[PDB]
């Protein structure tokens, strides 16, 4: 009997979601000028990982860059003068993410040893060590944002997300809902609300302090790899397997518009957006990372360059710079 | 280097130095062979382990060489989400129960067969080599001895003893892969043995030495 | 966090000396350090620096050939092996830990000091003394003969506080970032030569002398020493 109600439900939001969209974003940004070719240039290119680099975070100074690979090693970039700053070495080699502190005095990692370790920078010692150990996730770590300092957020691939406190080492809250590995997380600009990837084409959003799902998002084909919330934190870009970009508005609740192209049959490793939101730059496994109007649903340029799988996408806070990681354990920086 | 600030150059050595320590340690972590090791729950994975939450990783040196042993059977999530991160270790130990051709989860030997064929034909280990260990070598004769293989495979067609249907199980193991010239397979058959070390240290030997003809272009 | 050192004594004049500190609580390897000499008329010398690896080695124009300063990392130890001392070589030796990054705070630590007897960038302090009253808010300004605004943007300006009988400790590096441990009530500003150096309130323990160092380009000079009387 639940099953049917269950599905008079599902039909009720499929109803209430077809009685809107009174036009396509296509349509109304067929008025707006075209943004012409857009080509930025290897500023600099970083050096000394020696294995696949699998995740990047940009710091709130818009210099100070961190990065995983398969060494077992957690770098510290400069960024101006592609100086190394911090060499921190992992206990498990296995690190799927990374995240930069907001405040810059902690890194945070995580991978297949289903552990994130918060890592100390600023230290009387001079050197980098483990601050805290939050073990409790059964599955292996995918992603992990810093909400602020003393507080992590963290997704696994047990299909669930938890909020931490740093301090105390337990988690406070347990985000439930998902069916699928959450392979990827990015907190709203305000840090009020949260989004998640899933390995079951669906997207939920989250309430921090209420722990509930608010909405959920569907109409990909594949599994969710990477998800970027827009800058003014009304909207979010998610990248999938199925060669496919879905920008998702909050407030509508619907699919807004598609960033697909016949001649890309390749996944989606990770999205990112501009400043002003206009370029949607999308990280793909045919070695290249494509730059998107973010309106217009067009190619505006291709960041070529990298010889193998372009793992890792990373816009600093001001807008001005592009850092691309890849399997060539080789970051370019763009601009 | 003459437009640097007394701080600026201290911190290119800084980084200079950080470089040195980044290549002894790739040099270091360079003389360890990594081993993933697959198969099913019930398959002899545990007298594997001991032949001496997440990933579960073994030390172990026979000779001249050093092992990375990696157990990913405590991850009960999607393979092909985390799969990646394993190319490029040197060999894959795959193992099987001889005896779980005649119990069920559904029959135990075919999830093992669909299992290997997922593994040797993933995009990820295109040219890795295999280590398949076919596992309980008495317990698969005493129960060899009473029922045949045809419940296990209907077209079999041998003199039921222990010989003649090992090797059969072991060709049709061996069938499975789909680029027989390019990867390469070895397949031991293993019960309170000691010969496990010795033939793994065998495999890896040949796969470093195919590596390194595969990367000379001589054969 | 800790550098205690020894060898320190009366010394016949033209001798040999081997100063030495013992590292403890850091990590002694990743840090750079530097000798700095104080005369007993309180003023600052920087001596001789070695990176965190040898191979940078830095000495000032008055002990170059007859200073050498060498590091053992395995025992956390510096080394002064110093070779025909002479009258003007009596005073306080002091190590000061040091860190070389973006955002570092390469003046942080300072030793505690060993008395020895003995039997380029200019950096002006126009008050020698300043009396003044605790609870008021005071200035004390440093003058530099060559601009020390970088092309990075940086300006190599340091401040340090030397309380009666006790080691100098670090306050303002790079002219407007507060150090580790000091309050946000101390405040630094200035722009290429000019220099100031703000104090919202004065308390029992903001009485000393106040030194102006920059780290432009070697060698180290520091400022003549501004002392603050209450």
């Known amino acids: 009997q639940l099953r049917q109600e269950a599905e008079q439900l599902k039909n009720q939001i499929r109803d209430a979601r077809k009685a809107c969209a009174d036009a396509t974003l296509s349509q109304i940004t067929n008025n707006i000028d075209p943004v012409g070719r857009i080509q930025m240039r290897t500023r600099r290119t970083l050096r000394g990982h020696l294995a696949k680099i699998y995740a990047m975070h940009w710091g709130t100074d818009s210099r100070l860059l961190v990065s995983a690979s398969q060494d077992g090693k957690l770098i510290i970039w400069d960024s101006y003068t592609t100086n190394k700053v911090h060499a921190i070495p992992l206990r498990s080699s296995w690190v799927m993410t990374c995240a930069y502190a907001p405040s810059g005095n902690y890194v945070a990692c995580g991978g297949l040893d289903n552990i994130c370790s918060i890592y100390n920078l600023k230290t009387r010692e001079g050197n980098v060590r483990v601050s805290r150990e939050l073990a409790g996730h059964t599955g292996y770590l995918s992603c992990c944002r810093f909400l602020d300092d003393n507080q992590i957020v963290t997704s696994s691939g047990d299909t669930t997300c938890a909020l931490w406190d740093i301090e105390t080492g337990q988690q406070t809250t347990t985000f439930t809902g998902h069916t699928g590995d959450v392979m990827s997380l990015s907190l709203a600009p305000d840090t009020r609300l949260f989004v998640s990837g899933a390995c079951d084409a669906s997207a939920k959003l989250w309430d921090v302090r209420e722990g509930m799902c608010r909405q959920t998002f569907t109409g990909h084909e594949s599994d969710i790899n990477a998800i970027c919330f827009f800058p003014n934190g009304n909207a979010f870009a998610t990248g999938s397997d199925d060669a496919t970009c879905r920008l998702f508005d909050l407030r509508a609740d619907q699919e807004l518009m598609t960033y697909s192209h016949d001649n890309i049959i390749c996944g989606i490793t990770s999205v990112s957006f501009s400043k002003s939101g206009r370029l949607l730059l999308a990280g793909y496994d045919d070695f290249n990372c494509n730059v998107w109007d973010a309106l217009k649903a067009d190619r505006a340029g291709v960041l070529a360059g990298h010889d193998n799988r372009v793992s890792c996408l990373g816009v600093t806070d001001d807008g001005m710079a592009v850092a691309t990681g890849s399997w060539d354990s080789f970051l370019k920086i763009w601009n | 280097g003459c437009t640097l600030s007394a701080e600026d150059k201290a911190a290119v050595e800084r980084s200079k130095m950080i470089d040195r320590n980044l290549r002894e340690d790739g040099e270091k972590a360079a003389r360890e062979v990594k081993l993933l090791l697959l198969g099913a729950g019930e398959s002899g994975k545990s007298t594997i382990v001991k032949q001496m939450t997440g990933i579960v990783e073994t030390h172990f040196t026979f000779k001249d060489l050093h092992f990375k042993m990696f157990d990913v059977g405590a991850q009960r999530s999607e393979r092909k989400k985390w799969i990646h991160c394993f190319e490029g270790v040197t060999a894959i130990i795959f193992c099987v129960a001889l005896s779980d051709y005649d119990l069920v989860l559904m029959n135990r030997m075919h999830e093992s067969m669909k299992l290997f064929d997922s593994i040797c034909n993933n995009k990820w280990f295109t040219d890795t080599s295999i280590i398949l260990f076919l596992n309980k070598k008495d317990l698969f004769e005493e129960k060899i001895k009473k029922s045949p293989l045809t419940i296990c495979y209907p077209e079999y067609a041998g003199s039921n003893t222990y010989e003649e249907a090992a090797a059969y199980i072991q060709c049709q193991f061996e069938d499975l892969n789909k680029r027989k010239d390019t990867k390469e397979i070895y397949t031991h058959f293993t019960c309170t043995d000691t010969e496990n070390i010795r033939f793994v240290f065998a495999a890896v030997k040949d796969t470093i030495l195919q590596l390194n003809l595969k990367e000379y272009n001589l054969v | 966090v800790q550098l205690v050192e020894s060898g320190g004594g009366l010394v016949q004049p033209g001798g040999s000396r081997k100063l030495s500190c013992s590292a403890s609580?850091?990590?002694?390897?990743?840090?750079?350090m530097h000798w700095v000499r104080q005369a007993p008329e309180k003023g600052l010398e920087w001596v001789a620096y070695?990176?965190?690896?040898?191979?940078?080695?830095y000495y000032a124009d008055t002990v170059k050939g007859r200073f050498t300063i060498s590091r053992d990392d395995p025992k956390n130890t510096l080394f002064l092996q110093m070779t025909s001392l002479r009258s003007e070589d009596t005073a306080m030796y002091y190590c000061?830990?040091?860190?070389?990054?973006?955002?570092?705070?390469?003046?942080?630590?300072w030793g505690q000091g060993t008395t020895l007897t003995v039997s380029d960038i200019v950096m002006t302090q126009a008050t020698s003394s300043v009396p003044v009253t605790p609870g008021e808010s005071v200035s004390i300004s440093c003058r530099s003969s060559?601009?020390?605004?970088?092309?990075?943007?940086?300006?190599?300006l340091y401040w340090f506080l030397q309380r009666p009988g006790q080691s100098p400790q670090l306050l303002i590096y790079?002219?407007?970032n507060l150090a580790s441990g000091v309050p946000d009530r101390f405040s630094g500003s200035g722009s290429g030569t000019a220099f100031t150096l703000t104090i919202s309130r004065l308390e029992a323990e903001d009485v000393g002398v106040y030194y102006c160092?920059?780290?432009?380009?070697?060698?180290?000079?520091f400022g003549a020493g501004t002392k603050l009387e209450l």
């Open positions: 000061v830990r040091s860190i070389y990054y973006y955002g570092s705070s390469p003046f942080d630590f």
């Open positions: 160092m920059q780290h432009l380009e070697y060698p180290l000079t």
């Open positions: 070695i990176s965190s690896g040898s191979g940078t080695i």
């Open positions: 060559k601009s020390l605004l970088h092309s990075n943007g940086n300006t190599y």
């Open positions: 790079r002219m407007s």
């Open positions: 609580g850091f990590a002694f390897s990743s840090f750079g």
